[PDB]
Write an enzyme that holds these catalytic residues in place. Structure first.
Site, PDB file in Angstrom:
ATOM      1  N   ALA A 255       1.655   2.651  -1.909  1.00 35.95           N
ATOM      2  CA  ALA A 255       2.785   3.203  -1.162  1.00 35.95           C
ATOM      3  C   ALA A 255       3.526   4.274  -1.956  1.00 35.95           C
ATOM      4  O   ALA A 255       3.473   4.301  -3.190  1.00 35.95           O
ATOM      5  CB  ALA A 255       3.746   2.098  -0.755  1.00 35.95           C
ATOM      6  N   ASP A 256       4.212   5.155  -1.234  1.00 30.99           N
ATOM      7  CA  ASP A 256       5.083   6.156  -1.840  1.00 30.99           C
ATOM      8  C   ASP A 256       6.541   5.910  -1.455  1.00 30.99           C
ATOM      9  O   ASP A 256       7.444   6.098  -2.271  1.00 30.99           O
ATOM     10  CB  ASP A 256       4.640   7.567  -1.444  1.00 30.99           C
ATOM     11  CG  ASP A 256       3.322   7.961  -2.083  1.00 30.99           C
ATOM     12  OD1 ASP A 256       3.323   8.327  -3.277  1.00 30.99           O
ATOM     13  OD2 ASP A 256       2.284   7.912  -1.391  1.00 30.99           O
TER      14      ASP A 256
END
Lengths: 374, 367
Positions: A255-256
């Protein structure tokens, strides 16, 4: 002070007074380290993606500013306790201007800014610099600890779901790079893969190429080869055919930015993978430290999606030939992230706190609660 | 002009589609070995272009051998023609066009007079081979009219005057004799002033989309946007796409469609986003002899297509004993996911309510 168990390459090479970053653009053919001496060096490294991966970006940013400010304090450019404090806040704002989508950079540097305000400006400039150094060193060690947790929670949960069925070994499909190169140590989604491999429970990790930057083909494959992790490289478009023709136990991605409702910003193609995962009945897991979680953003439509230079698609990152024809009525759409809505995160969100399974219906995830956990 | 097949009585030249868009190279096809290698190496590619060049390649090679006395009698020509059709069919297995064309040509060679002159039997086959080129041109002229009319009418029902089309691979003049299939439809919409934009998937690992489709759109000023394969889902959610129009390599009796790898992925996402999917192909791409998608042989190709920079031959991926590369170059789109219909020269065949959604034998037997 310590080498990682499991193979260095580490993308971040830090020792008191020195930061070196592996040029992740040149792997796997070339192993090159560049000195980070200034705040301008670390900004460029992030912008050019010499260092990349959400956690690695945030950790190197903190270390980069720390080494640069300590340097300025030593040579004479700084100065005074107050103006070291002023420089630190100004450097935090500037480095934050590099890449917008991943929240780790923003969560880390804003938290550092608040701690910088708490520092004593009466101290002798170098004392204020050393205080920030210890804070920056803390974000590296914390990330190591976060990943150690993620690996355990992720592997145990996936293995429990495997043994509930009739399966002793798991097949994992992933995207991008989420290993030691994208983090401080071990990684997130690939960290889970590593733990399954060490326990003798991994059949195979399938890695999507991940166009146009090729994080999968270049970096993820490289990491698996160095540790003899059984790996299969596929083209991004082959993902659907793979899940239909072969048994895939879980899709585990990184994830970012994870919004309050659970909406996940991640490398372009992740949404495509999630849509197909639901179609084929393959549960999808998002692995990330809690520093990747974002209470300040409510849903996926409020995330700024970075778009990058069209040359990433049109030109060879190697031979430097323009491999695509050019014309006045041609355009290139190059978003480097997309949003996976919380509905499609069917497996759960894996942090250092544990594995958070989705709710039965709407607000599937409460991100504020995950951060509030002990 | 930008045709992959250059034919004139006594001469066949093939554009090396591996070298586009940087290089424009034509190679002489003089022997049956030349045309087999051209197909195998993908110097010529695209289902219809493979079948057309195969027929022309065999015709030219045989006419040359009949001229210089390498084939003495009419039965020597006959035997060479039948055995050459079998040999060329061994090149690439998935696309049925090659097999439908050459098997149809074999039966016609069987009823030729073997006692005739060597040049006379060869010329008869030449005319038959020339026929498959002109027929494909005519097939594509139909496809573009049927497809563009249906898609435009479907958009007008939703209140739109211009259409946005998402496609994969290359299905234009390079992949066919002329105009193309799925890109043929795009061309027709563009000429009528009814095309807003064609979105082209890169189409890894061979890059038919990025290298060939973009090239075709640039040469004709067709508004085009290139995307990476993984961005297709994000595109359909964020922007209005009127239709996904793809080509075909083999369409089974039930409607199951073998097409370039990634097409199934596109179809899955198309259904999720409520975007109707169309399969454009000539009836020579239809296959009554194959019942469903699970009976299609899917070609897998050299792992260097993914692991190495395409000629230059340099590795861009690390290598190890416990690494494998999965490189299927086709996948199956089940008839359920062909929601728009199957576009042939016969017309746009809409799917049924349930059951087998398509009757391929019925489409072939239409006028």
């Amino acid at each position: 002070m310590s080498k990682p168990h499991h193979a260095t390459l580490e993308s971040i090479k830090y020792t008191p007074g020195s930061l070196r970053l592996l040029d992740q653009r040149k792997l796997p053919l070339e192993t090159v380290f560049d000195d980070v001496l200034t705040v301008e060096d670390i900004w460029s490294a992030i912008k050019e993606m010499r260092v990349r991966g959400a956690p690695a970006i945030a950790v190197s940013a903190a270390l980069g500013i720390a080494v640069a400010t300590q340097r300025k304090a030593a040579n004479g450019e700084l100065k005074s306790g107050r103006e070291v404090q002023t420089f630190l806040l100004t450097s935090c704002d500037f480095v934050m201007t590099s890449r917008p989508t991943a929240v780790n950079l923003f969560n880390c540097l804003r938290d550092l800014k608040a701690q910088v305000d708490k520092l004593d400006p009466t101290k002798a400039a170098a004392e204020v610099a050393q205080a920030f150094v210890e804070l920056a060193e803390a974000v590296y060690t914390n990330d190591v600890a976060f990943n150690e947790g993620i690996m355990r929670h992720g592997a145990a949960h996936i293995l429990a779901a495997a043994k509930a069925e009739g399966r002793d070994k798991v097949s994992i499909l992933t995207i991008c790079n989420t290993g030691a190169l994208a983090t401080s140590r071990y990684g997130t989604a690939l960290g889970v893969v590593r733990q399954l491999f060490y326990d003798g429970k991994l059949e195979r990790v399938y890695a999507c190429e991940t166009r146009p930057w090729n994080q999968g083909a270049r970096l993820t494959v490289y990491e698996c080869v160095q540790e003899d992790i059984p790996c299969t490289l596929i083209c991004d478009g082959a993902a659907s055919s793979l899940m239909l023709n072969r048994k895939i136990d879980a899709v585990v991605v990184g994830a970012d930015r994870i919004c309050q409702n659970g909406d996940t910003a991640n490398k372009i193609g992740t949404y495509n993978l999630a849509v197909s995962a639901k179609f084929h009945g393959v549960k999808l897991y998002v692995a990330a430290p809690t520093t990747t979680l974002d209470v300040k953003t409510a849903s996926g439509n409020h995330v700024e999606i970075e778009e990058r230079e069209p040359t990433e698609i049109t030109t060879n990152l190697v031979t430097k030939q323009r491999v695509v024809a050019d014309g006045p009525h041609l355009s290139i759409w190059n978003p480097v992230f997309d949003i996976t809505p919380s509905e499609l995160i069917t497996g759960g969100i894996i942090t250092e706190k544990g594995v958070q399974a989705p709710a039965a219906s709407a607000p599937y995830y409460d991100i504020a609660s995950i951060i509030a956990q002990a």
